[PDB]
Structure 1
Amino acid sequence: MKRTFQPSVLKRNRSHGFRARMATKNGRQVLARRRAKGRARLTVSK
């Protein structure tokens, strides 16, 4: 049984990383929402 989560750090950062978020107007609104909510981890960047 292959499951849905097949981790890959490169794909993770290219898909949801900080620079991926900053690339688009909508990704920068994700960061604004998570900053407003007070999220300790802003992105998947560690």
Structure 2
Amino acid sequence: MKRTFQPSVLKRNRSHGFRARMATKNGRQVLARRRAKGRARLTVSK
């Protein structure tokens, strides 16, 4: 059975990447929540 996670680095950084967060007003507030909470690694960008 073909599972629901077929990983792909290029599609992960194009969608949940940092520069994906910065390009939209709603995404920019997503980071400001993570920084305020005090998260170690913010988005996904390994």
Task: Structure 2: give runs of 5+ residues left out of the alignment.
Answer: none
What do residues 17-38 of structure 1 show as CA deviations (whole Å, max 9, x unaligned)? 0000000000000000000000
| 1:27 aligns to 2:27 (yes or no) | yes
Gaps of 5+ in 1: none
Cα deviations across residues 1-46 of structure 1 (Å, max 9, x unaligned)? Answer: 1111110000000010000000000000000000000010101100
Return the TM-score normalized by structure 1. Answer: 0.95
Aligned residues with identical type, % of pairs: 100
Separation in 2, partners of 1:23, 1:43: 14
Following superposition, which runs of at least 4 residues in structure 1 exceed 2 angstroms of deviation?
Answer: none
CA RMSD of aligned residues (A): 0.5
